[PDB]
Write a protein that binds this ligand. Sequence first.
Ligand SMILES: CCCCCCCCCCCCCCCCCCCC(=O)O[C@H](COC(=O)CCCCCCCCCCCCCC)COP(=O)(O)OCCN
Ligand SMILES: CCCCCCCCCCCCO[C@@H]1O[C@H](CO)[C@@H](O[C@H]2O[C@H](CO)[C@@H](O)[C@H](O)[C@H]2O)[C@H](O)[C@H]1O
Ligand SMILES: CCCCCCCCCCCCO[C@H]1O[C@H](CO)[C@@H](O[C@H]2O[C@H](CO)[C@@H](O)[C@H](O)[C@H]2O)[C@H](O)[C@H]1O
Ligand SMILES: CN(C)c1ccc(O)c2c1C[C@H]1C[C@H]3[C@H](N(C)C)C(O)=C(C(N)=O)C(=O)[C@@]3(O)C(O)=C1C2=O
Ligand SMILES: CCCCCCCCCC(=O)OC[C@H](CO)OC(=O)CCCCCCCCC
Ligand SMILES: CCCCCCCCCCCCCC
Ligand SMILES: CCCCCCCCCC[N+](C)(C)[O-]
Ligand SMILES: CCCCCCCCCCCC
Ligand SMILES: CCCCCCCCCC
Ligand SMILES: CCCCCCCCCC
Ligand SMILES: CCCCCCCC
Ligand SMILES: CCCCCC
Ligand SMILES: [Cl-]
Ligand code: NA
Lengths: 156, 1034, 48, 48
Amino acid sequence: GSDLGKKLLEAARAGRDDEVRILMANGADVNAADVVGWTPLHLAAYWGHLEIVEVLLKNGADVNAYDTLGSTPLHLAAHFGHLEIVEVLLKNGADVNAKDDNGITPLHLAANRGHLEIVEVLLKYGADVNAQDKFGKTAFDISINNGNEDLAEILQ
Amino acid sequence: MPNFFIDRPIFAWVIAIIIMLAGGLAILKLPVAQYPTIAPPAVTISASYPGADAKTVQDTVTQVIEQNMNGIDNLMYMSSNSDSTGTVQITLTFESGTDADIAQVQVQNKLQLAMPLLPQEVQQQGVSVEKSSSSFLMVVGVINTDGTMTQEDISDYVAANMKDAISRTSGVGDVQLFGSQYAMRIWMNPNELNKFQLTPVDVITAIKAQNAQVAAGQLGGTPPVKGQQLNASIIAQTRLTSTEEFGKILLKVNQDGSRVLLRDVAKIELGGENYDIIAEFNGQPASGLGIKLATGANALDTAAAIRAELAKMEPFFPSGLKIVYPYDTTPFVKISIHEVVKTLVEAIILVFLVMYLFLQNFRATLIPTIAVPVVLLGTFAVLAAFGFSINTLTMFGMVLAIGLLVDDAIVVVENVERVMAEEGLPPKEATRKSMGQIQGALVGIAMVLSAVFVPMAFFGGSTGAIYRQFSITIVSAMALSVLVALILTPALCATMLKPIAKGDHGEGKKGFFGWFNRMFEKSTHHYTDSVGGILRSTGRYLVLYLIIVVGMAYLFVRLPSSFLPDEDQGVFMTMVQLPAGATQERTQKVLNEVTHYYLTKEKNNVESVFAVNGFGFAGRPQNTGIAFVSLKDWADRPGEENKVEAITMRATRAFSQIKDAMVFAFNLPAIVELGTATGFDFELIDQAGLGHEKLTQARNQLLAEAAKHPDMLTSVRPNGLEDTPQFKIDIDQEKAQALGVSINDINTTLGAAWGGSYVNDFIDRGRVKKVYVMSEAKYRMLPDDIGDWYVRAADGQMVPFSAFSSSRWEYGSPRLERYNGLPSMEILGQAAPGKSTGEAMELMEQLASKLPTGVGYDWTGMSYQERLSGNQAPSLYAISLIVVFLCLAALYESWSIPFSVMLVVPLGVIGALLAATFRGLTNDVYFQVGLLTTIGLSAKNAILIVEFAKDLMDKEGKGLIEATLDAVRMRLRPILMTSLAFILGVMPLVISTGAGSGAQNAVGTGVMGGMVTATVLAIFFVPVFFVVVRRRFS
Amino acid sequence: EDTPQFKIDIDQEKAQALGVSINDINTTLGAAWGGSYVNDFIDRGRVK
Amino acid sequence: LGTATGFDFELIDQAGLGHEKLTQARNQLLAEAAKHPDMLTSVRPNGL
Ligand SMILES: CCCCCCCCCCCCCCCCCCCC(=O)O[C@H](COC(=O)CCCCCCCCCCCCCC)COP(=O)(O)OCCN
Ligand SMILES: CCCCCCCCCCCCO[C@@H]1O[C@H](CO)[C@@H](O[C@H]2O[C@H](CO)[C@@H](O)[C@H](O)[C@H]2O)[C@H](O)[C@H]1O
Ligand SMILES: CCCCCCCCCCCCO[C@H]1O[C@H](CO)[C@@H](O[C@H]2O[C@H](CO)[C@@H](O)[C@H](O)[C@H]2O)[C@H](O)[C@H]1O
Ligand SMILES: CN(C)c1ccc(O)c2c1C[C@H]1C[C@H]3[C@H](N(C)C)C(O)=C(C(N)=O)C(=O)[C@@]3(O)C(O)=C1C2=O
Ligand SMILES: CCCCCCCCCC(=O)OC[C@H](CO)OC(=O)CCCCCCCCC
Ligand SMILES: CCCCCCCCCCCCCC
Ligand SMILES: CCCCCCCCCC[N+](C)(C)[O-]
Ligand SMILES: CCCCCCCCCCCC
Ligand SMILES: CCCCCCCCCC
Ligand SMILES: CCCCCCCCCC
Ligand SMILES: CCCCCCCC
Ligand SMILES: CCCCCC
Ligand SMILES: [Cl-]
Ligand code: NA
C-alpha cells in the first residue's frame, strides 16, 4: 500500500472524478486494496460512480479483483442496482459467473434485490441460470421465495 | 441626607460598621469556583448494549427512548449518538432558568415507562440519567511504578478503597472512575467447547444456576406450632466469590464419569468490564478519579479536603501505587484571588499617594482609605444576597469597578478641600456647601450608570449568564459607592479634615510640595487659556470629533471578536486521529511516539503525559486517542517560548510529519460550552425518511458548495464519523431448521463469543461485580474464526457456523446522529477572517435551501443561543440610551443639555480600540465590560463639569464661556487625580505575563488606553460639547 | 444481637446424578419453608 | 367550576356488594329521583 493508493481508494469511494484524473496522471496504484481486499474499482462499483469505473478500467484496473470473501466489483454493482456499471464491467471482461466463498453469483444478488434490467444483462452475457450457492439455491429459487412474479417469469 | 450625616457622624460610622460585618461574614461564607454555571441545563440519558452496532443501538434503544420523551417542560432541543461501541447518549437541553432537578426527574420518569420496551440486555446494564457538565475541579491519577498492577487492577483498587471516601469528602459533588471495578471474565475456547459438545449457551445456563442467591425460609417461622422454642433463618445457595469457584462450575458429566468444569473450556480471571480504553501516565498503567465541585461548595476547601483524605489512604496502598495530580484548577483560582486582592490593595495605596501628592495632608488620605474597603466589603454582602460566588468573572468585575469606587471617594474629599481653600469656610460648613454642589449629581450618576449596566444582565443564553455576573457585581459596587458618598464620606470630611485659610493653595510652601503647587497652579492657567482658545474656534473640533467617531467605527469592525482569553493553565491536549478501521495497537504506537516527544523535546516543560488510547470527543472507536499533557510549575517555565501557546505550536509542527495519523496539540478553552470565536453549529436533518445514505450524499453536496466560498466559510467539516467496512453474516433459516439448530442458540453463540454477554453478578470481597462471558481474543479476530464456533443441534450433533451462514463485506455507520427525533448530521465551521458569524450562518442557510427534497436543517448549541441573544441587543442598547437621556434630562431640567454629556462616549472607546488593536488583542467580554466602565467614568467627569457650569449660569448669572471656564478649572484636579491613580492601578495587569495574564491583559489594556484618551480628550471636548449644545438650543 | 443461621447446602452434582433439576429443589425448599407469592385473586371485589 | 345549577353525585359500594347489586341501588335511586320532578331534573347515569 502506497500514499497515492490510499488517496485513490478515498477518491474512488467519494466519487471525486477530478481528483481520480490527477491521481491516474501521477500513477496512483489501481490495484491498491484496503484490509478487506476492496480495490478502487470495488469502491466505485459499490457507491455507483460510473465515470471513475470507466477511468480505472482504462488505467488497467483488475475487472475480476476479489475481496477476502471472494466478491468482485460485478457482485457489488449487480447487488446495488447500478445497471450502467454492470454493462461497462461486462464489456471490459468481468466474469459473469464469478462465485464468492458462499457460491453466490451476480445473478443471485440481482435476483434477491429484484433488479430486472440487471438480470437480463447478466443472462445476455451468458450468466449460468442453473448456478447453485452453498445451500443449493438458484436465482429462480430466490425469485419464488421473494414472491417476485416478473423475475420468476424471466428466469424460465 | 449628607447634611443629616454631617451632624450625625456616629450614625454614619454605625452604617459603615454594619456594612463591614455583613461583608466580613459574606467573605467567609461565599462559595469559591473558577467559573459559575453558564450553559443552560442539559440532561444526558446514557445506555450500553454489549457487542451492539450503531444501527442495532439506534433501532432498539435510541428511537424508543426518543419517542417517549414527551410531556417534559421547557425542552429547547434533543440530540443523540448511537455508535458501534454499543453505546447511546441522548442529550436534552432545557431553557435557561429551568430547575435542573425537575428537568432530570421529568426525563428519568418518562424513561422509566419506556424501559419495558428496551432489549433485556439493555435493561440489565441500566440507563443512566445525569445532570450534564464538563468542568472538573481536578483529576486524581492513580499509577503503578513497580510493574505489578495493570490498569484493570488499579481501577478495581480505586473503586474498592478510594472512590466512595472521595464521594463522601466535604464539597465533592460527583466522582467518575477512569475505568471499571473488576468483572469475572470467562474467556471461552471454542476448540474445548466443541470437544465436549458444549456451546456458550451451556456456559451461561450453568453460571446462572451455580452463581445465584436462592431464597429459603425460617425454622419455627410464623404461623408456628404452639410450643416452638427456636426461630432461625435458613441460608440456601448464595453468590460465588472467587475465580476458583467459577473454575469448578459443572458443565457436563461424561459417559465414563469424568467431570467437565468451566476451567476446562475457558480462562477465568478478574479483569475490566471493557477493554476499549488503554490509559498510561508516562508509559505506566493508570486509572484515576474525575472530581466535580458540589453546588455552593468552596473549591479551595474541597481540594484541600480531597488531598487530606488521599493522605489517609497512603498507608494502605499496595507497593508501587502512587497518587498524581495531572489536572487541578485550585492553584490557578488561588493565584486569581491573590492577584485581585493585590490589585485592590495597590489601588488603595496609589489613591493614598495621589491624594497626598495633591492635597498634602494625611487626614485627607485616610478618608478614601476607609470608604473604598467599606464599599468593597458591602459589595460581597450583596453578591452573597444574590447567591453569587467569588469566581473569575465576579472578581474581575470588582477590578473593572475600581475606577468608579476610587472617583466617588476622591470627588467628595477634593471638592471639600477646594471650597475651604477658595472661600475659607471651616470643615463642617465647607462639607455642607461642597455636598450641596455634588449631591444631586451623585444621585444622577447612580441612575445613569444603572441605565448603562442593568440592561447588560438581561441578555439570554450562555453569554447572558456571563454578562449577568459583571452587571450585578458592578451595579452593586457602584450603588454602595454612592450611598457611602452621601452618608459616610461627608461625615468623615466634616470631622477629620483640618481648615485651609482662604487663598492658601500651598504656593508659599518650600521644597517639592511648594514647587508642585506652583507648577500645577501655573499648569491650570495654561489649561484654562487652551480651553479659552478652543472655545473661540469650536468648528474644527466638531470636525476632529467626527474623525474620532469614524476612526472608532473603523477600528471596531477590524477588531476580531472572541469570548474569554486562552490561559496558561499548566495543561493542554494532543488529539491522535488515525484512518478509519485502524486498530488499538496502531493508535498505541502513535501515542508512544507523541509521549516520547514530550518527555524528550519538552523535558524542561512537561511533567507528565496522560495517554488515553481509544477515546475521542466525537466517538471513541479503536482509531482515536488523546494525550493530556501536564506542565511543570509556572516558576520553572520562564519566557513566552516555554508557555502553553509556544509548546502547542512546536508540538503541532513536529507531529505534522507523522504519516497516516492526524496529530495536533491545542490549549484548553476558558469555558468549554461557549465554543470557538465566530464558530457555528449546523444540523442537517432527514425530514422525509430518506435514510442514512441519501442524507450522507446531501451532507457531501452541502460540504462541496461550502468549500467554494472560502471568502465567507472556513473549516466546514462534519462532527461525526464516516461509514466503514462491516461484516454482514446471513443465517440461513431453512438450513438451521433442516439440521435442528435453534436461532436463539446461533444468535447467543455468535453474540456471547464475538460481542460478550453480561450473565449475572458475583460478590468480590464484599462488593457486587459483573460476570462477563466472551471468546478469548485469538478465536474472534478474523472471518475464518467464524467457522471454528459450533452449535449443538436437537439430535446432539455439533454443527459449525459455516454450515448454516453466508457472509459479505458492506459499508455502514459506526455512529448514527439524531436531532429532535429525526436522523441528522452535525456540521461545524466558522466565519472567514473579517466576516461575522451572522454572515457565515446566512450563507449556510442559502446553500442548505439548494439540497435535495426532504433534507431540512436547524441551528444548535452556540448558534441557537446567538440567534436568540443577537435579537435582544438592539432593544437593550436602545433602553440604555433612552433611560440615560431621561435621567440627565431630570438632573439638568433640560431636553438639550443631556447631549453635552452623552457625546463623551467615543472619547474613551477610541483609546480602548487603539490599545487593543496595537497589542494584538480581541473584542472579548473583559474588553466590552471595560468600555462600559470607561464610558461610565468619562460620563461622570462630564456630568459634574456640566452641573458646575449650569449652576454658575443659573445661580451666579455668569456667561456660558465664563461658567464653562470656571467649571473645567475646578474639575481639572479631581479628574487628573482619579485618572493618575486608576491608570497606575491597571498598569500591572497590562504588563502581567504570569498565570491568568490573558484575563489581566484583556481587563487592563482596553481600560488603560481608554482612560488615557478619555482623560486627555474630555477635559478639552466636554467644554466644547456644552458650549455647542447651549448655543444651538437658545 | 447476632442470630443463629441454619445453612442448608444443595449438592447440585449429586442432584443432577439422581435426575432432579435445581429449579424444582429451589422452588420446593423456598415455597415450603419461606412461602411463595404465586398470583392475585378477588376476595369480595378486592384484589388480594 | 360546574354547569350552573347541576350536581355531580357518586354512588359508592362500601361493603363489597358487587356491580349487580350496585346497579339495582342506582336504579332504585334513579326511580325515586323521577318521583320528585318539582326538585330534581335530568337525573341520569354518566356510565354505560
Ligand atoms: C422611577 C419611577 C417609579 C415611581 C417612583 C415615584 C417617586 C419618584 C421620586 C420622587 C422624588 C421627588 C422629590 C420630592 C421632594 C420634595 C421637597 C420639596 C422641597 C425642596 O426644595 O426639596 C428639597 C430637596 O431638594 C433639593 O434641594 C435637591 C436639589 C435639586 C434637585 C436635584 C435633582 C436630583 C437628582 C435627579 C436624578 C434623576 C432621577 C431620575 C428618576 C427638600 O427641602 P425641604 O422641604 O426639606 O426644606 C424645608 C422647607 N420648609
Ligand atoms: C494623538 C492625540 C491627538 C488628540 C487630539 C488633539 C486635541 C487635544 C489637544 C488640544 C490642545 C489645545 O490647544 C489650543 O488650541 C487652540 C486652537 O483652537 C489654540 O487657540 C488659538 O487659535 C484660536 C482660534 O484662532 C485663537 O482664538 C486663540 O487666540 C489661539 O491661541 C490654543 O492657544 C491652544 O492652546
Ligand atoms: C481534563 C480537562 C478537560 C478539558 C476538555 C477540553 C474540551 C475540548 C474538546 C474539543 C476538542 C476537539 O478539538 C477541537 O476543539 C478545540 C477546543 O479546545 C479547538 O481549539 C480551538 O479553541 C481553543 C480555545 O482554547 C484555541 O486555543 C484554539 O486555537 C482553537 O482552534 C480545536 O481547534 C478543535 O480541533
Ligand atoms: C474518558 N475518560 C475520562 C477516561 C480516561 C481514562 C480512562 O482510563 C478511562 C476513561 C473513561 C472510563 C469510562 C468507563 C465506563 N464506566 C464508568 C465503567 C464504561 O462504562 C466504559 C464503557 N466502554 O462502557 C469504559 O470503558 C470505562 O470502564 C473505562 O474503561 C474508562 C477508562 O478506562
Ligand atoms: C452615557 C451613554 C452610554 C450609552 C452606551 C451604553 C450601551 C450599553 C448597552 C448594553 O447594556 O450592552 C452591554 C454590552 C454587552 O455586550 O457591552 C458592550 O459590548 C459595550 C458596548 C459599547 C458600545 C460603544 C458605543 C459607541 C457608539 C455610541
Ligand atoms: C432598567 C433597565 C431594564 C431592562 C429591561 C430589559 C427587558 C427588555 C426585553 C428584551 C427582549 C425584547 C425582544 C424583542
Ligand atoms: C471603627 C469605628 C471608629 C469610630 C471612631 C469615630 C469617632 C468619631 C467622633 C467624632 N466627634 C464626635 C468627636 O467629633
Ligand atoms: C422613547 C421616549 C423618548 C423621550 C423623548 C422625549 C423628548 C421630548 C422633547 C420635547 C421638546 C420640547
Ligand atoms: C435578572 C435580574 C437582574 C436584576 C439586576 C438588578 C441589580 C441591582 C443590584 C443592587
Ligand atoms: C500650546 C498648547 C497648550 C496646551 C497646554 C495644556 C496644559 C494642560 C495641563 C494639564
Ligand atoms: C476561604 C477562602 C476565602 C477567600 C476570600 C477571597 C476574597 C476576595
Ligand atoms: C437630597 C439627597 C437625595 C438622596 C436620595 C437618594
Ligand atoms: Cl496631616
Ligand atoms: Na433470537
